[PDB]
Amino acid sequence: GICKSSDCIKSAARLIQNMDATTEPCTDFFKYACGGWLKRNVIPETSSRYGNFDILRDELEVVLKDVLQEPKTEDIVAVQKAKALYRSCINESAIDSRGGEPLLKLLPDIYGWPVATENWEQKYGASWTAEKAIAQLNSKYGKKVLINLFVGTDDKNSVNHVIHIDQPRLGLPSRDYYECTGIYKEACTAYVDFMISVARLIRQEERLPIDENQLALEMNKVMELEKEIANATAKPEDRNDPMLLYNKMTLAQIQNNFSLEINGKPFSWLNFTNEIMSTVNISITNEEDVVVYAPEYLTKLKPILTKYSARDLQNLMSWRFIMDLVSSLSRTYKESRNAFRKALYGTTSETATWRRCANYVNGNMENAVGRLYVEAAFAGESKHVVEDLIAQIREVFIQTLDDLTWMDAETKKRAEEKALAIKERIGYPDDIVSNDNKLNNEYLELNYKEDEYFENIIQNLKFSQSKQLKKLREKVDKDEWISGAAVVNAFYSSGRNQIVFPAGILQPPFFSAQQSNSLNYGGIGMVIGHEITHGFDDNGRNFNKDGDLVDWWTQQSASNFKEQSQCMVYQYGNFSWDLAGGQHLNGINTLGENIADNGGLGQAYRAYQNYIKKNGEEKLLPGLDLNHKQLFFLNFAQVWCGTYRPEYAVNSIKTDVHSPGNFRIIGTLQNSAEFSEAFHCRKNSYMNPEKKCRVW
Amino acid sequence: GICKSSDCIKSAARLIQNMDATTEPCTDFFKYACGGWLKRNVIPETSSRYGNFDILRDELEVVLKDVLQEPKTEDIVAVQKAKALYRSCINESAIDSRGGEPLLKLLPDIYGWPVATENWEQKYGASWTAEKAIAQLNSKYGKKVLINLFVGTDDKNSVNHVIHIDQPRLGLPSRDYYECTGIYKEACTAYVDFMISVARLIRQEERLPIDENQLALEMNKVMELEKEIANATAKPEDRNDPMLLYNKMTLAQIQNNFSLEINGKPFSWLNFTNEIMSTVNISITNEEDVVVYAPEYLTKLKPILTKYSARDLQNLMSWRFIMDLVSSLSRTYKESRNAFRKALYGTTSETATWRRCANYVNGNMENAVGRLYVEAAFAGESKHVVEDLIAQIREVFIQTLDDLTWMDAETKKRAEEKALAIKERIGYPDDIVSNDNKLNNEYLELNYKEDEYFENIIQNLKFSQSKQLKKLREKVDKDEWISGAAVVNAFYSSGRNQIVFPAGILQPPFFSAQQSNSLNYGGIGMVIGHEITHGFDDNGRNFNKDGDLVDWWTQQSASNFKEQSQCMVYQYGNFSWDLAGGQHLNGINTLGENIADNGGLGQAYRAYQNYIKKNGEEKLLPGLDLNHKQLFFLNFAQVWCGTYRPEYAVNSIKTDVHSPGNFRIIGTLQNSAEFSEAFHCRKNSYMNPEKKCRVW
Numbered sequence A, B: 001g002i003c004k005s006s007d008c009i010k011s012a013a014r015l016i017q018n019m020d021a022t023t024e025p026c027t028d029f030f031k032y033a034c035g036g037w038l039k040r041n042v043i044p045e046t047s048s049r050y051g052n053f054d055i056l057r058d059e060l061e062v063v064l065k066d067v068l069q070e071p072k073t074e075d076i077v078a079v080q081k082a083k084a085l086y087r088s089c090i091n092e093s094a095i096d097s098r099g100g101e102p103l104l105k106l107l108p109d110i111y112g113w114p115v116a117t118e119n120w121e122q123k124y125g126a127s128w129t130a131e132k133a134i135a136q137l138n139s140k141y142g143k144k145v146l147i148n149l150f151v152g153t154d155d156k157n158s159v160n161h162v163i164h165i166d167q168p169r170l171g172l173p174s175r176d177y178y179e180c181t182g183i184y185k186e187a188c189t190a191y192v193d194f195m196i197s198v199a200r201l202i203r204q205e206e207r208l209p210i211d212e213n214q215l216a217l218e219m220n221k222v223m224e225l226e227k228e229i230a231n232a233t234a235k236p237e238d239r240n241d242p243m244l245l246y247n248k249m250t251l252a253q254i255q256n257n258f259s260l261e262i263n264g265k266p267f268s269w270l271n272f273t274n275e276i277m278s279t280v281n282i283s284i285t286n287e288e289d290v291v292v293y294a295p296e297y298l299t300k301l302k303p304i305l306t307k308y309s310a311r312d313l314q315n316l317m318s319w320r321f322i323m324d325l326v327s328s329l330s331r332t333y334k335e336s337r338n339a340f341r342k343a344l345y346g347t348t349s350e351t352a353t354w355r356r357c358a359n360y361v362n363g364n365m366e367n368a369v370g371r372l373y374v375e376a377a378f379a380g381e382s383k384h385v386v387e388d389l390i391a392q393i394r395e396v397f398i399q400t401l402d403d404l405t406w407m408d409a410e411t412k413k414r415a416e417e418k419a420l421a422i423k424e425r426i427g428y429p430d431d432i433v434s435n436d437n438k439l440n441n442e443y444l445e446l447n448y449k450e451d452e453y454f455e456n457i458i459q460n461l462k463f464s465q466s467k468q469l470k471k472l473r474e475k476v477d478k479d480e481w482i483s484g485a486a487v488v489n490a491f492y493s494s495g496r497n498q499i500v501f502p503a504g505i506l507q508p509p510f511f512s513a514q515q516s517n518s519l520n521y522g523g524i525g526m527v528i529g530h531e532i533t534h535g536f537d538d539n540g541r542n543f544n545k546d547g548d549l550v551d552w553w554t555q556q557s558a559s560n561f562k563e564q565s566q567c568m569v570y571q572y573g574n575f576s577w578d579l580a581g582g583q584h585l586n587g588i589n590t591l592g593e594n595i596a597d598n599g600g601l602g603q604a605y606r607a608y609q610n611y612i613k614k615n616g617e618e619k620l621l622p623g624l625d626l627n628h629k630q631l632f633f634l635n636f637a638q639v640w641c642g643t644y645r646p647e648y649a650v651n652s653i654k655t656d657v658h659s660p661g662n663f664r665i666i667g668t669l670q671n672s673a674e675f676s677e678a679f680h681c682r683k684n685s686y687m688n689p690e691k692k693c694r695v696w
């Protein structure tokens, strides 16, 4: 009664090699499921974390290199461009030759970088306007500094676009870093030293005198400024309610309610917006509707900005863009980033050039690269099997609604509506392979030079920014995929009410039409469940079947959601992370993902139980003294095999909305009665606490 | 009739994942056995080649890191030293702080480096003597320049040591490179540029004026000199007959037959030898017996050396030592080596610091590190099984003697004598684990400082050199192992008539007491056979049962050996290597190894056939439509799964005595009738030529 197929022995060996049978499954399931893997592996010097996901990503880069490196005769223009972008990226001889020259040429366009410019006030200060300086960086280069103004889908009308105003991203991973003490000390030191290093490289190349003391005085004034901007920013915990975050205002009321005095002006919100929108020849009036996500940040900003000059602000503004370009310049410029990335990521080295380039072209030409990927790596008969698993999981989500005591019939009926309306995307959009003009027209405006990598990167910035800005009066395209196919991940869009399973994640250990169903349901099944549950998490639950931010919950069911969820907030907030220095997880920031993990695995398990009821038991795996219910949980846990570098662990606890892999395993299985049943766990064993959290 | 053990499914998955079933085994067995592996893998940026051997080596480094990084309470002094050497090596902050300072301190001890010294003639030239300058580098630092004088086992008396005189190693991989054209152009340019770079770093640190033109003039004069020394050196093809290479002379006849005039002196062979031997307080007379391996080189050297000054010679002499120290200094010094190693190895990066350090301490404290390795990684019940496989393979070597038509009864009886006398070493010497004083006394003279890595490396150079020089009047220790245990390799010593199987190679795919015997015989069995056959190759056949260079062959059997071998010289010389630019293998240089591969696999196969005769057929592997005879050849071929970087392929074709992995597979299986029988290969199919080479 044992399976002896090639595909069953491959999976049994992987399961066997990764696990640690000497560990009690009911004491620590991460150690039991992953112990063998952790012992054999060390995180690469170029990696911040390593494990199942990162290994599959590394392997996907191999396939990209194969398809991108060799020109072919019948290659369509779109494919030629991807390959020519790749070739321009991999020629380090050509890049090195140019030094920082392409950046030197760029600086006058952005009002310069005051620290690396002589007489900045006479040269740039004279014309300088906050609304012109911020807009230039925004519209031409996609770099959002001081005020983050973007064109995006209306949360309250999923067919239209709106101008949004939000707090900007910071140079350090999170606002937390700005304390600049203990765990953050090395990151802050390496950040300012990186500002100093680049400023010195530019001065040397521009044949300017270098005063080390004035470099440190000016660069510490940028940190001083960004520390204030960071403290003004709202916490993620104060941004997790989409209904409270959504504030629709006219540009008139923004000018009235959020005044700013920059360089003793004041700030004209209308001039700023038109300075951005004219790039795309769109006229904006004071009767323009704007979604303001950060009203408190805009209020706090007012007394911050009056304190600094045009020179102080532009020193931060240009640094924020320059810090992103340095890695596209010569070795000397690339090297200036060494201590900063080690402090943030723990990595002592950059990834192979061919890997960075394969990723760069995949990120910028997702449909051209996705097409090449699928031909090479993806079997279309998998698409059909995955469609069927999704239909089974959506069904289990609806069936489960009835068993949920914490919701009323009225809210349950609307959750059924949302689930039935979920739009699934499996593998790749057919059009990328079958429609050559469509694929060619999407890149028509791009023209790459093989000796001009920096110009190629700059062209991509302007193009992606023009693409997004032009969407303002345009409607949201229902046929658009939220991800390319050459991606090892899955997604959910609230605004589109859509679940996506790129071809990249549709491979072992997640899925194979030849591996056992216990393994498929525990892998891809759990992942399908996770994406569906995102539609019903603390954020997703706020959007209807059409992707509109509208309340569809009764006061009671909504209060019950919050009550049921709070249990997971405490459970996960109580997990201490040794790699992050004993620090506790953010139970509030990781909530959405934790709901998705717990719901998703339960839904997958019930679908697997229904599969058995209908089809009977599966043939047991060779070399494993585990039944199929146990293999279900073994495979789910192996999806999360991995470890983190201490510096990256310190980063992710603050920036990532997901719990670390080990706690996604421990947390989920602690709440699963089906797990403790399958592993015959004793009451109050570490993996079997009496109190079990449950929302979905 | 199929095996379903955990250990059989692990091996079947590895075999399955590495092979390519879409390839005809009789068209290309490398592609069929390794195709799956080649497709999935790319050579790492830090690797010159990658494959089975390198993967196992990388994995062994993981184990070394585990055992070396954590101090333990009951650690013996020998273990504390290994761990403290490791810790000194991994602290790059401490190393970087020192710059090139530890090298600056070293230079006056070696008569300086003229290019990075002001007024070298007044400072060093005044006292300078070729015999003092060459001796200093030799005795204190183990650096052999111009004349390679060493203490080693007497080829004609395996119990004693003798002073040997040979041609030195060159800064570039082989003499071939010195053409400096085409394939060698980038290596020669990067070599001289590396001399220039280090000279400039030293001048900058010593606050000296830098004249770029005089750096290039002096450094090109070192290349000019080394090009002459390289052309004077004898080819490996002219060094493959141990009987012709062995020339016993007295120091008197060396002074009479090989005069040298350095700095218009002439050279005193007695002063040179005593300058070396006094380091160890050994007096040498002109009646001292010396083995001269390079008499023609010494003759050609005479008109070369008269042409150059003390300044020109010392510029090469110190560079040859400095080029080896640069990687033990700060980042700036480490970086000066970037283009040179890329030209020789194709690597764009150095391996992880912890990996270089684990290797460094394993290479210098092989018994301390081996002890830690075996406790952590090696099961002693494997030792017994391997002993038994060796006894079976030695037996098959003797049995086969009878079937050999090309040898006479008299030579066959002496080959039986040599084989019966072979001394086997399996896993590790018991003493490393059970005898603490012995282990502690071997490192007694070493005292490491954790903040002083360079001093630690310098101490190891002097210690290893004193150890070797002191052996002159001492007898050869019969109990000495030719390798440490933490090594993924196997060896044969002609002088000791000994075969070694370190614990590091006694693991899958080579060996496991739980994997199928077809896999064990095809893996470790082949490797045991290879090591035994080395005792009877074109070099080994010249040494008797006691390790003495004595003729035991009849004129006919010896001529027949040469006749039988010539077939392999042609077969392998006819293989064109695409990675080495279509270049052909050296059929003469790879002969010894090719004999060992072909003999070794045949001996292993016959032992496997005898195993079946006695024990019956083995249970078939799941997921494989291959019988056990086929699995034998599949596993042998998987031992050689791998690929090379083009630059390293250009290096190895010239420097390595082994054929590349793919040709070791194709060449061996082409000559194997048993292979074509097992795979039902058609006559004159690529894998089945009519003419089959055979010696052993």
Ligand SMILES: CCC[C@H](CC1(C(=O)N[C@H](Cc2ncc(-c3ccccc3)o2)C(=O)O)CCCC1)C(=O)O
Pocket: A049, A050, A051, A053, A054, A489, A490, A491, A492, A527, A530, A531, A593, A640, A641, A642, A643, A644, A658, A660, A661, A662
């Ligand atoms: C935009 C969000 C997409 C996300 C997709 C999923 C996800 O969580 N994907 C990756 C998983 C990942 N990368 C590295 C590691 C890792 C490293 C070491 C140890 C353990 C793990 O795990 C992630 O972003 O966490 C949900 C389920 C699987 C796919 C979502 O829906 O939240």
Ligand SMILES: CCC[C@H](CC1(C(=O)N[C@H](Cc2ncc(-c3ccccc3)o2)C(=O)O)CCCC1)C(=O)O
Pocket: B049, B050, B051, B053, B054, B489, B490, B491, B492, B527, B530, B531, B593, B640, B641, B642, B643, B644, B658, B660, B661, B662
């Ligand atoms: C001092 C000589 C020791 C040697 C030991 C053996 C050997 O040949 N060992 C290694 C094998 C090796 N390293 C990397 C690769 C490789 C990389 C890519 C593709 C293919 C292969 O293969 C070697 O030095 O070639 C004989 C049989 C096995 C062990 C001997 O007896 O000659």
Ligand SMILES: [Zn+2]
Pocket: A530, A534, A593, A596
């Ligand atoms: Zn998620």
Ligand SMILES: [Zn+2]
Pocket: B530, B534, B593, B596
């Ligand atoms: Zn060999």
